[PDB]
UniProtKB/Swiss-Prot annotation, chain A:
Keywords of this entry: Ribonucleoprotein, Ribosomal protein
Name this polypeptide is given: Large ribosomal subunit protein uL14
One Gene Ontology term, aspect cellular component: cytosolic large ribosomal subunit
GO biological process: translation
InterPro entries per record: Ribosomal_uL14 (IPR000218), Ribosomal_uL14_sf (IPR036853)
Keyword Ribonucleoprotein recorded: yes
Family: Belongs to the universal ribosomal protein uL14 family.
One Pfam short name: Ribosomal_L14
UniProtKB/Swiss-Prot annotation, chain B:
Binding site for GTP: 26-33, 92-96, 146-149
Residue ranges of the region described as Disordered: 430-496, 907-930
PROSITE patterns (alphabetical): G_TR_2 (PS51722)
The protein's name in its UniProt record: Elongation factor-like GTPase 1
Catalyses which reaction(s): GTP + H2O = GDP + phosphate + H(+)
Organ and tissue specificity: Expressed at low levels in brain. Expression is highly increased in glioma tissues.
Organism: Homo sapiens
Curated annotation (Swiss-Prot), chain C:
UniProt GO cellular component terms: cytosolic large ribosomal subunit; extracellular matrix
SUPFAM superfamilies with a match to the protein in the record: Translation proteins
Compositional bias (Basic residues): 17-28
Species of the source: Dictyostelium discoideum
Annotated gene: rpl3
Protein name as annotated: Large ribosomal subunit protein uL3
Top-level division of the source organism's lineage: Eukaryota
Pfam families (alphabetical): Ribosomal_L3
GO molecular function, one term: structural constituent of ribosome
Primary location class: cytoplasm
Family statement drawn from the similarity comment of this UniProt entry: Belongs to the universal ribosomal protein uL3 family.
RNA sequence: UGCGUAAUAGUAGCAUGAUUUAGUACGAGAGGAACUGUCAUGCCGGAUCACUGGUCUGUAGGUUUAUUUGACAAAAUAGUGACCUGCCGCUACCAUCCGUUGGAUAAUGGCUGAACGCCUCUAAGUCAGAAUCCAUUCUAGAAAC
RNA sequence: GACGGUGGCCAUGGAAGUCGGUAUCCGCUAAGGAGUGUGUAACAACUCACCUGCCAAAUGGACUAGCCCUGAAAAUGGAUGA
């Protein structure tokens, strides 16, 4: 799932961390944390984490949030990777700290996206682009 | 029109008889895109098709190709053209694909509809279901033919094939016409011709000059083979088209100078102009020359297409010029191949100049056609109508001028309500209350506020771009946001969304009402209003308020501040509707109840009762999940009533957790609804449905029942009935080959019974249930019956003046009129087929007079033993030959029941009984201050004298007695010969020559037989008659469709139930009888599982008690 | 045992399995295309020299992309491309065993290549008078007769011929004490035509402009960096000593099983890190430059915007160990075999190809100048720094 | 002693997604494709270091502790005193660039066509045709020239 | 060429040789089953059984056993000893 990239996949993979990394929910829904289970499309090989997306969809969970949203897996969307990258451009976007949002399995983000969102992510997921006034 | 406002429309909407209701409709929403596309462009309050396609309307090419994609929506499409108003409104009724009540409901939300009929297939369950209602109503529906630019663009043929297509359409429609009505003379009109203008003075006079030729209606005033005064159309939408015959005529007119009417006639069928100088010579009207469409009009279109394909800039322009219209602006602005076409078909498209006139010509007033549509659907009922003398107070004068009153009282009519907890836009807030502000918003929230919205959205959290010219400019709806407001307005606020919280009072519906204003009162009617109920389906007519006549007496009023369909949503501005309209109830009302028509009158004869069933009785006894949400289901079913006409919520016959539907998938849909769009719970479904009737084939043999039909000596009727059960629980004492009695006390209190067949007509009426519950119980306290006594006799023949049993009557002399009083348990539901036979005044304190059922007849006293009888033999009628289910298709007989039996048979069982009760023998006459024996004597009037010396207070105790009656009866049934009387709907399937065999095959596969065929007079269509069971008739239409291409149209009429060969058994509940071992296939069939999860049904009765009672679990059986 | 995974590829391609120290410190050739086009001006192969890399922005031409034209930085390899002098011809002969060098035919033109194939003759490892002309250099006037005699022979003998080419590098700063000879199989036209062309060449000294285009897919051949005696953890893509509690430095762990009861050839093992040839294929090239010396020195990119204000392309200073540009160059799209005293024998691709972004003609914008601690962005940053002060920063370090 | 040849051996790229096709074919419907093209990714393989990140005996500079050299200063010891920067260098799908095309077949589909008047992909004969086969390209270079 | 009584009787608007079932008989002919299939809503049409024209002398089945093939896949490369 979902899947819709992009055109392209907005080029190479970069992560803040793979499996077992907290990033904030950045969402009006009362998920307060997002912890990764795994990432979609990772086919992977012998001993290698299923590694965080640059703006791609993930199997996640609400570890600390609303108890209703707590437990039960959730497809999400990575929004900003603390750990850095170069783009086809020659810039190195880098962030304060990791972040994403909990989302629908057609990609759609629920409420409104908080804070700054890398443009690649927006490009990937049109709903994301729609539901924010910050796309930097 | 690009510019229209609601300020102009509200004033012109007040007046009536010059408005003309028009509606959009199709068989499965086929040709919906085409109709809508052309209308959107025309409409001005949405600012053309540039800022169009808002307020729910999803256009698709799939549909055109052939596709349903059904949806419930509405666009506010009023027109302030010239000096008049035009209440069109884009009605999109989803309907349903199979025949049903749903189809009847949804489709009836239309006045003066245009109907798209036959996509690329006819004589289906689709076309004969939805449009079955529309062509029945004489509302002057116009013949809209399918897309013609498919033949030009997609398939790529010459315009000569258009004619062929038209012909084909006509042919298809002929079949449809011949389902109802008659179509022997109309097969001549299912062709393409114009036999007029063959004379020399016509061929060069009215072809060069104008003159005039008639285009008026002929024979039929429906959609069958008529021009409808120049409103027949060829509706297309690939780049948007809005055109038809009129358009074609217009072009022709422009070439030299011929009248439009004349031209239209020519263009309906074939006409042959030689084109020397638009003058014709005869010889070409018997042989031919060249038809019109390929000569001119569509030829031009074809040429244009060709030009486009090749890519020519001036050629296209030239073609356009030739075609007799202006060439437009976008010819050297863009490269313009399709763009040019698009440009032209925004200038060309506003049909309001042409079509409105045509409409007017067709339809002088909506007042006229309203008189012809009362007698075509339910208004009094299925028997009588309001147009006839039954139910006539002030209706005939009212619906001639339309509406109930000219001052607007409001009414109701079901057309399926909107889904709550999603849309909840009707509110008690200032901006909908203020009717002007909302109107203003509506006219400004198409492409004007959109820019503002955009500005708000992108530039509020600050910095979307990084080092760009978005934050630098900071637009307030100026130069940047002006773009992207012509192909589609980005974020325009289409339906005026919910600013404040949800308060759901949404409803779809129809009401015809006069000039309604804001702050208008209506007298709200209760959850069950008796007066209303008493008015419909009978000749009664009266208007009075509650004086204890309804269940709830009330003197309270409800407000009604608007009339809305939710087409522009919220509390609208356009509320001053004329007599006759497409809108439903508004204000704070979503009550479209069955027994509560919202009116200003406190009670009135209901104008439309809720819709009628296509196939009678489709049910399922489901149960919900998790404990607190048990009444939730019930609550939901109150909302379900509002939506669909039939659900078992009002009046408990089978209990409130049961659906009532007509259809194949309708039931399924209903099931899904109460998980989704009403109550948000989740419930246990059970797709096995409809328990069949259990008929006993013949009586038992010589054992303890001497009055009988001789012998039961058969091996098996279809499955064995002798060695499968019985003969050892209470058969070790008496009866070798079977068991028709009991020996628990062992001849202290015993009985013997018989189950004969009963004639089928008689059964049918019984099972309809004409008798009431009070007709069989408590006649001393309530009123003593009279009209009901003879009716019963007419059905089941038995009386207190019959001392030779049931046998005499069943055989000889049917339909007598006598009193059938003093009956305990007349059937399983107390209104059914079974009866307990009185063949005695008094045996020995048994078998005479009910608990309080009397005919004013007594041998000595009314006192007898009615308490132990009535409860016992009720349970005997509810456990069949395989345990469970009601005895249906049977007239029960009681040979004898004898209490106070001083005889007895020496055995272990007897000994045990003796030990238990310490009685030397049974009685009632005597006592030792021991045991029980309840009777009717004690509660009615104390002691018993005359019929017996002492009152019965002795013999086996009452509970035990009650138990034992059930047991013996159960035993008797089990041993008797029995067959499965399967539930049936006869299939009067409209079929054609090639698809009879296929249909028959299906029937063969799924049980039944073809009885006979009836042929339609003067057509290739027939109608085949064939019985088919009810259980297999579900998913039948779909199957038919799959088999060929839906060329046969099914319709399931109810034609009683019949005996067919299937194993009528199910594993016995008693483990002593399961030692015989009923087989897993033949004594537990898949057809015979309608009981584990298909029998939880009780408004009236479904009680099954645990048999045998004898003190404690240690003292029950010790020597036994 | 199953395995039990799947993947275990041989960590490493087996395709380079001998992994020796490759002999020829120029990209050794053993492969060219074949043709008979009237255009025989193509020779197949140049040889330049790597002297570092820089980077460049260029708007890219590949519609269908997320953006059809958009600025992007690409890295870029630059190589000094001096003159290829051609001291002789070598003919060949077609045969069973392969081909053969019967004997060469050298004209005259230059004799600097000679005192590189030298200073190694007789007792004490080496001497500086020639003991041998015994596989070597002929005369001049009494040399051309031989050529005439043998030209005719090679004209007739249809086996292909290559030119005994060589680059000039003592004209660069590197002062190479190794001989830098290279074959260039002449292609296109008749055998006779080819030999005539070769003959003509001896009179001249070609440069790369004639061989390749500004937009032209090369297959670079070089010698990768020879990183030393080195470990398996580092020589292949093998995951290491599983734990800290483990007892190895330099291991696989299993090296082949009791299985066939001797070790297998193919098993990850440490040796020395690839100093091989390899052939990086289809380097599109963005520019041939004009040669620096005797004007062209202050001209590597022309006009302001799209070539920007004038400059030399080169990376500044003499470098603590390395080279700085002084001749015409090739802007190969990123990366090549080895470091910066290393010979990139070039050859046009075998299967020259259209595809998409193999041929797409291409334009540039800003271009870097390296090292950030000590210097900045060439002439502009030179100026600003100077203005700020001459005690602080100017941007020239010898 | 040059510059070559290439027997022999090994051999590498594999795969996905989006998009076009196309909401077209197909389909009663609900749903719903492909050949080709286009742009990217996963893993893998070969390089590289223009960029960025990583590191530090560059003990290159600073900041600071304790100590010692009378103070200032400049140095030491503290087995690299600690800390912040940090070059060259080495390196990270923690960066970048690169990984082709011919015949031969398999299954299989045919063609003519007998045995066997017809008929048949077959027996004679032969057409197309896999990630296959073998070459091309690529690594090494024989007591081989 | 492959007909008639004939839509034989059943079931069945209809199923006529052929949804399906039964009895399955005779006339005329060299020749034709109340019919092998295809097909038809079903009839028909074609095809078969059945008969003749031409070509012109061999043909058809059913088994039997010799070799060959199918069956017949496992692990370092590979063994009629080569």
């Amino acid at each position: 799932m979902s899947k819709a990239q992009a055109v392209g996949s907005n080029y190479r993979v970069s992560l803040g961390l793979p499996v077992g990394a907290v990033m904030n929910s950045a969402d009006n829904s009362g998920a307060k944390n997002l912890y990764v289970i795994a990432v979609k499309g990772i086919k992977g090989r012998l001993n290698r984490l299923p590694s965080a997306g640059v703006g791609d969809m993930v199997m996640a969970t609400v570890k600390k949030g609303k108890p209703e949203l707590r437990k039960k897996v959730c497809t999400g969307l990575v929004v900003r990777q603390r750990k850095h990258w170069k783009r086809k451009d020659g810039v190195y976007i880098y962030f304060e700290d990791n972040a994403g949002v909990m989302c629908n399995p057609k990609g759609e983000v629920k409420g409104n996206i908080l804070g700054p969102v890398a443009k690649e992510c927006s490009d990937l997921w049109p709903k994301v682009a729609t539901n924010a006034g910050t796309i930097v | 029109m690009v510019l229209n406002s609601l300020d102009k429309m509200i004033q012109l909407q007040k007046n009536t008889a010059n408005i003309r209701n028009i509606c959009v409709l199709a068989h499965v929403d086929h040709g919906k895109t085409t109709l809508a596309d052309c209308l959107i462009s025309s409409n001005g309050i949405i600012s053309s098709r540039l800022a169009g396609k808002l307020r729910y309307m999803d256009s698709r090419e799939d549909e055109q190709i052939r596709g349903i994609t059904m949806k419930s929506s509405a666009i506010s499409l009023h027109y302030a053209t010239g000096n008049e108003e035009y209440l069109i409104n884009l009605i999109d009724s989803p309907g349903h694909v199979d025949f049903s009540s749903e189809v009847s409901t949804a489709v009836r939300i239309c006045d003066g509809c245009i109907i798209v009929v036959d996509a690329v297939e006819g004589v289906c369950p689709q076309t004969q279901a939805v449009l079955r209602q529309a062509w029945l109503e004489n509302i002057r529906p116009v013949l809209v033919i399918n897309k013609i630019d498919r033949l030009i663009v997609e398939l790529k043929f010459t315009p000569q094939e258009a004619y062929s297509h038209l012909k084909n359409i006509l042919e298809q429609i002929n079949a449809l016409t011949g389902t109802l009505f008659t179509s022997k003379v109309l097969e001549e009109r299912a062709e393409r011709e114009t036999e007029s203008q063959v004379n020399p003075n016509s061929e060069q006079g009215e072809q060069v000059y104008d003159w005039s030729t008639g285009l008026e209606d002929t024979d039929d005033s429906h959609l069958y083979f008529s021009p409808e005064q120049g409103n027949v159309v060829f509706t297309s939408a690939i780049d948007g088209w809005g055109f038809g015959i009129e358009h074609f005529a217009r072009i022709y007119s422009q070439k030299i100078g011929i009248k439009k009417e004349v031209l239209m006639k020519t263009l309906w069928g074939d006409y042959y102009i030689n084109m020397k100088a638009k003058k014709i010579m005869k010889g070409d009207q018997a042989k031919g020359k060249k038809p019109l469409f390929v000569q001119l009009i569509l030829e031009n279109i074809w040429s244009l297409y060709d030009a486009v394909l090749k890519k020519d800039k001036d050629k296209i322009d030239k073609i356009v010029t030739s075609l007799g219209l202006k060439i437009g602006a976008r010819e050297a602005r863009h490269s313009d191949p399709k763009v040019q076409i698009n440009a032209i078909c925004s200038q060309w498209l506003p049909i309001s100049h042409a079509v409105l006139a045509m409409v007017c010509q067709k339809l002088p007033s909506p007042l006229d056609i309203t008189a012809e549509r009362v007698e075509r659907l339910m208004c009094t009922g299925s028997q009588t109508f309001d147009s006839f003398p039954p139910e006539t107070q002030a209706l005939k004068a009212a619906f001639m001028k339309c509406g109930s009153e000219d001052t607007a009282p409001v009414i109701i009519f079901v057309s399926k309500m909107f889904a709550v907890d999603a849309k909840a836009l009707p509110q008690n807030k200032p901006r909908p209350l203020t009717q002007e502000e909302i109107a203003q918003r509506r006219e400004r929230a198409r492409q004007r506020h959109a820019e503002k919205l955009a500005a708000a959205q992108g530039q509020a959290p600050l910095e979307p771009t990084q080092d760009g010219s978005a934050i630098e400019t900071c637009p307030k709806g100026e130069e940047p946001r002006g773009d992207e407001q012509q192909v589609e307005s980005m974020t325009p606020k289409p339906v005026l969304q919910e600013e404040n919280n949800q308060e759901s009072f949404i409803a779809f519906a129809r009401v015809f009402s006069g000039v309604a204003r804001r702050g208008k009162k209506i007298f709200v009617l209760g959850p069950k209003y008796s007066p209303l109920e008493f008015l419909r389906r009978v000749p009664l007519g009266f208007s009075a308020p509650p004086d204890g006549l309804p269940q709830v007496p009330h003197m309270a009023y409800c407000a009604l501040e608007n009339l809305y369909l939710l087409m522009g949503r919220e509390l609208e501005y356009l509320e001053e509707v004329p007599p006759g309209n497409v809108l439903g109830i508004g204000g704070l009302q979503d009550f479209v109840l069955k027994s509560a028509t919202l009116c200003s009158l406190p009670s009135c004869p209901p104008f439309i009762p809720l819709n009628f069933e296509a196939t009678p009785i489709v049910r399922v006894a489901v149960e919900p999940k998790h404990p607190s949400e048990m009444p939730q289901l019930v609550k939901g079913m109150k909302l379900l009533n509002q939506a669909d006409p039939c659900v078992q919520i009002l009046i408990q016959e089978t209990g409130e957790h049961v659906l009532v539907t007509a259809g194949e998938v309708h039931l399924q849909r209903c099931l899904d609804d109460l998980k989704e769009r009403f109550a948000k719970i989740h419930i246990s479904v059970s797709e096995p449905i409809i328990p069949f009737r259990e008929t006993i084939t013949k009586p038992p043999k010589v054992d303890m029942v001497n009055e009988e039909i001789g012998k039961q000596q058969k091996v098996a009727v279809i499955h064995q009935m002798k060695e499968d059960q019985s003969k050892i629980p209470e058969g070790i004492q008496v009866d070798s080959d079977g068991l028709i009695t009991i020996t628990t006390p062992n001849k202290l209190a015993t009985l013997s019974v018989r189950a004969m067949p009963l004639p089928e007509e008689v059964t049918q009426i019984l099972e309809e249930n004409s008798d009431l519950i009070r007709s069989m119980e408590q006649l001393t306290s309530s009123l003593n019956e009279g009209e009901n006594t003879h009716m019963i006799h007419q059905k089941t023949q038995e009386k207190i003046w019959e001392f030779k049993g049931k046998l005499e009557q069943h055989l000889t002399g049917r339909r007598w009129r006598n009193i059938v009083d003093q009956i305990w348990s007349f059937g399983p539901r107390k209104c059914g087929p079974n009866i307990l036979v009185n063949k005695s005044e008094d045996f020995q304190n048994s078998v005479w007079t009910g608990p309080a059922d009397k005919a004013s007849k007594e041998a000595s006293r009314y006192r007898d033993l009615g308490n132990s009888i009535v409860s016992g033999f009720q349970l005997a009628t509810l456990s069949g030959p395989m345990c469970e289910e009601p005895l249906m298709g049977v007239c029960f007989v009681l040979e004898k029941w004898d209490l106070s039996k001083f005889e007895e048979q020496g055995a272990s069982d007897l000994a045990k009984e003796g030990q238990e009760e310490n009685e030397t023998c049974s009685g009632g006459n005597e006592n030792q201050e021991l045991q029980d024996g309840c009777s009717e004597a004690f509660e009615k009037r104390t002691s018993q004298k005359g019929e017996s010396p002492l009152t019965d207070c002795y013999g086996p105790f009452s509970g035990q007695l009650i138990a034992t009656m059930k047991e013996a009866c159960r035993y008797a049934l089990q041993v008797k010969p029995q067959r499965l009387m399967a539930a049936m709907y006869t299939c009067d399937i409209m079929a054609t020559g090639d698809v009879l065999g296929r249909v028959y095959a299906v029937l063969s596969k799924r049980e039944g037989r073809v009885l006979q065929e009836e042929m339609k007079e003067g057509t290739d269509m027939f109608i085949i008659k064939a019985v088919l069971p009810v259980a297999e008739s579900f998913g039948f239409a779909d199957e038919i469709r799959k088999r060929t291409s839906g060329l046969a149209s099914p319709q399931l009429v109810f034609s009683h139930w019949e005996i067919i060969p299937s194993d009528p058994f199910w594993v016995p509940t008693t483990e002593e009888e399961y030692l015989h071992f009923g087989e897993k296939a033949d004594s537990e069939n898949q057809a015979r599982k309608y009981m584990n999860a298909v029998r939880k049904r009780k408004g009236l009765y479904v009680e099954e008690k645990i048999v045998e009672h004898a003190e404690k679990q240690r003292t029950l059986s010790k020597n036994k | 045992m199953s395995h039990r995974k799947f993947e275990a590829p041989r960590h490493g391609n087996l395709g380079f399995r001998p992994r020796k120290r490759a002999a020829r410190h120029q990209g050794k050739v053993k492969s060219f295309p074949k043709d008979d086009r009237t255009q025989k001006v193509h020779l197949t192969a140049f040889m330049g020299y790597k002297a570092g890399m820089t980077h460049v922005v260029r708007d890219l031409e590949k519609p269908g992309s997320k953006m059809h034209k958009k600025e992007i930085v690409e890295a870029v390899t630059i190589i000094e491309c001096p003159p290829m002098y051609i001291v002789g011809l070598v003919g060949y002969v077609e045969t069973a065993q392969g081909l053969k060098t019967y004997k060469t035919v050298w004209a005259q033109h230059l004799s600097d290549n000679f005192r590189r194939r030298l200073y190694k003759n007789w007792y004490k490892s080496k001497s500086k008078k020639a003991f041998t002309k015994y596989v070597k250099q002929y005369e001049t006037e009494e040399g051309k007769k031989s050529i005439e005699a043998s030209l005719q022979a090679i004209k007739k003998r249809c086996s292909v011929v290559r030119v005994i080419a060589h680059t000039q590098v003592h004209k660069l700063k590197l002062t190479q004490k190794k001989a830098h000879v290279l074959e260039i199989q002449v292609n296109g036209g008749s055998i006779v035509e080819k030999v005539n062309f070769a003959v003509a060449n001896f009179e001249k000294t070609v440069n790369v402009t004639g061989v390749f285009a500004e937009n032209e897919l090369i297959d670079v051949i070089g010698v990768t960096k020879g990183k030393g005696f080195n470990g398996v953890i580092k020589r292949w893509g093998v995951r290491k000593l599983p734990r800290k509690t483990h007892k190895g430095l330099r291991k696989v762990a299993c090296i082949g099983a009791w299985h066939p009861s001797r070790v297998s050839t193919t098993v990850p093992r440490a040796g020395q890190l690839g100093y091989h040839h390899r052939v990086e294929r289809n380097k599109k090239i963005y520019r041939i430059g004009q040669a620096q010396p005797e004007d062209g020195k202050q001209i590597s990119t022309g006009k302001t915007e799209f070539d920007l204000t004038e400059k030399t392309i080169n990376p500044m200073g003499g470098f603590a160990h390395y080279g700085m540009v002084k001749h015409e160059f090739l802007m190969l799209k990123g990366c090549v075999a080895g470091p910066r005293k290393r010979a990139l024998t070039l050859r046009k691709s075998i299967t020259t190809q259209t595809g998409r972004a193999a041929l797409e003609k291409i334009t540039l914008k800003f271009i870097d100048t390296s090292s950030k601690f000590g210097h900045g962005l060439h002439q502009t940053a030179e100026d600003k720094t100077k203005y700020f002060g001459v005690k602080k920063s100017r941007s020239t370090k010898a």
